[PDB]
Amino acid sequence: MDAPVVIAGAGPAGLMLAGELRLAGIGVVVLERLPARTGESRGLGFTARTMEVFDQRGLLRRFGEVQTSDQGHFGGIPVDFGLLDGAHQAAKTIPQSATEAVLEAWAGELGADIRRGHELTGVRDDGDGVAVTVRGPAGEHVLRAGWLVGCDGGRSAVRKAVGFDFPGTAATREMFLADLRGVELEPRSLPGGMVMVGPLPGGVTRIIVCERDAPPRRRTGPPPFHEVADAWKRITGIDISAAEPVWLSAFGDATRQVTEYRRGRVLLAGDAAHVHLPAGGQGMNAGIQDAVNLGWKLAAVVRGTARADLLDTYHGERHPVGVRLLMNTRAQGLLFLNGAEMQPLRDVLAELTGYPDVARHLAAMVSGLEIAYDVGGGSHPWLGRRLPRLELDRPSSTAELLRPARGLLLDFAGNAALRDRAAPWAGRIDVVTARPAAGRVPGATTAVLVRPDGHVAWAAPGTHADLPMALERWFGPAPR
């Protein structure tokens, strides 16, 4: 055994997963094909939920001051996100290159074995372990591990070598993205195609080129600038061929998702599990959020404290999130790429987005705060959902207590009787008697059991199963 867990890929997903595992004292080897981070800006910022999970690991202070923005929108149609509490899109200026840099520094200091320059070329499941063929700076060797996780992007080697079913719709077009230095472009339903224009920090202009009736090309592959410039000039009639390319990329509208996130001792996360239209503002957030769901569960299984059905909750909870992720990205794409044939439907929708019922509903889709797992029956509003950041009188917060990434039993009523019911699971969770003071708290909530990912598994009152059942379910068997 070279490590309990091997992760292929050091993007946002793999790096977050490595951090989540290391927090739980698990040994993890990360295989990254690239010798360094690309430094691609890609998307700017991340959703409210992603900001919340960073805060749960004390990673927010590492970005400096982030700027919130309730200026959200859906498929080009402007929507107010302030109508739903805390759904504000955030970090609108923080590029993925910076987020990757923060995460890789975080994983490394935690003891992640990040081996850059190593490419996964093969994998077989021994049933009781996984054999991983690797190509590194010396040559081709073989690592073996308890579990393999594929966080190796949309072209995932792991996915193909294990034989995951990857259904969906193929690409119907090609689009261009270009960050440009040296042109004055104004932030804009013309024929020939659609175009988006926006500014970036440091005098950089970001353009999106979606020409009408453009064919989907398999790329290696950064696009040649002149090909992007001619596509642009064909649509807008503005010559930009004398600009300076900061970064160019080509992408398709292909959307696919693995039928199962788990095959034996091999799991998938991020773009490896779900691929979709990159310019939709959800991908990185989905990969980081997949990693936070799986990390503490995979950790418990390795330690042997987990119940036999825990690891399967990764697929159980995250696959529906992925389905809804593809629906969201596909729907927004239609309102974006298609020309005037989609305009009447764009208009009808634009007439509905003023109604606060609609605004809140669309905001919850994008922010990712609508995410609600099935964790059992109960009338409590938090059950299966994220625990919102509460500030506790003890001077700590729920986000701060979740930094070690262990389960929390929060005791608000100072009840000695339920603290004794939790006794067998001592060492697996922390019992914290404190007073909520932030503090959106429903009805007469006296206690709440919080999963390491921040999701509420149980809550008094309003949960069918009682505390010992919820504890056994999410934190494993304990002789009683």
Ligand X SMILES: Cc1cc2nc3c(=O)[nH]c(=O)nc-3n(C[C@H](O)[C@H](O)[C@H](O)COP(=O)(O)OP(=O)(O)OC[C@H]3O[C@@H](n4cnc5c(N)ncnc54)[C@H](O)[C@@H]3O)c2cc1C
Tell me: does residue 271 bind ligand X (CB under 6 A). Answer: yes
Among 226, 216, 227, which residue's Cα sits nearest to residue 251? 216
Tell me: does residue 293 bind ligand X (CB under 6 A). Answer: no
Rounded least distance, CB 361 to a second copy, Å: 7
| Among the listed residues 65, 184, 309, 357, the single contact to a second copy using CB under 8 A | 357
Tell me: does residue 150 bind ligand X (CB under 6 A). Answer: no
Closest to ligand X by CB, 25 vs 224, is: 224
Rounded least distance, CB 355 to ligand X, Å: 26
CA distances from 9 to 35, 154, 295 (A): 12, 11, 15
Rounded least distance, CB 288 to a second copy, Å: 23
Name the H helices within 74-224.
Answer: 96-109, 157-162
469 binds, among ligand X, a second copy, none (CB under 5 to 8 A by kind): none
Q: How is residue 222 annotated by DSSP?
A: P
Strand arrangement of the beta sheet that strand 456-460 belongs to: 429-433, 407-411, 447-450, 456-460
Closest to a second copy by CB, 213 vs 341, is: 341
A 10 A CB-CB count for 322 gives 18
Q: How is residue 462 annotated by DSSP?
A: S
Tell me: does residue 170 bind a second copy (CB under 8 A). Answer: no
Among 200, 187, 197, 180, which residue's Cα sits nearest to residue 93? 200
| Residue 189 identity | S
The three-state DSSP-derived secondary structure of 163-177 is CCCCCEECCCCEEEE
Question: How many Cα atoms sit within 13 Å of 229 on the Cβ side?
Answer: 12
Among 161, 115, 158, 157, which residue's Cα sits nearest to residue 138? 115
Tell me: does residue 309 bind a second copy (CB under 8 A). Answer: no
The residue range among 149-157, 226-234, 312-320, 352-360 that interacts with ligand X, by the rule CB under 6 A, is 149-157
Tell me: does residue 256 bind a second copy (CB under 8 A). Answer: no
328 binds, among a second copy, ligand X, none (CB under 5 to 8 A by kind): a second copy
Among 466, 459, 453, 464, which residue's Cα sits nearest to residue 16? 453
For residue 289, which phi and psi values (nearest 5 degrees)?
-75, -25
| Among the listed residues 327, 426, 438, 444, the single contact to a second copy using CB under 8 A | 327
Tell me: does residue 10 bind ligand X (CB under 6 A). Answer: yes
Tell me: does residue 430 bind ligand X (CB under 6 A). Answer: no
Tell me: does residue 19 bind ligand X (CB under 6 A). Answer: no
CA distances from 320 to 259, 325, 438 (A): 11, 8, 31
The residue range among 35-43, 80-88, 115-123, 335-343 that interacts with a second copy, by the rule CB under 8 A, is 335-343
Q: Binding site annotation covers 13?
A: yes
Closest to ligand X by CB, 8 vs 311, is: 8
- Beta strands, E only, 34-139: 44-46, 71-74, 77-80, 90-95, 113-116, 119-125, 130-135
142 binds, among ligand X, a second copy, none (CB under 5 to 8 A by kind): none
Distance CA 457, CA 470 (A): 7
The residue range among 27-35, 104-112, 343-351, 432-440 that interacts with ligand X, by the rule CB under 6 A, is 27-35
143 binds, among a second copy, ligand X, none (CB under 5 to 8 A by kind): none
Tell me: does residue 431 bind a second copy (CB under 8 A). Answer: no
Query: Binding site, residues?
Result: 13, 32, 42, 96, 120, 271, 282, 284-285
Query: Binding site for FAD, residues?
Result: 13, 32, 42, 96, 120, 271, 282, 284-285
| Residues making contact with ligand X (CB under 6 A) | 8-14, 31-34, 42-44, 96, 119-120, 151-153, 157, 177, 249, 251, 270-272, 278-279, 281-285, 287
| Residues making contact with a second copy (CB under 8 A) | 169, 172, 326-328, 330-331, 334-335, 340-342, 344-345, 347-349, 351-352, 355-358, 361, 365
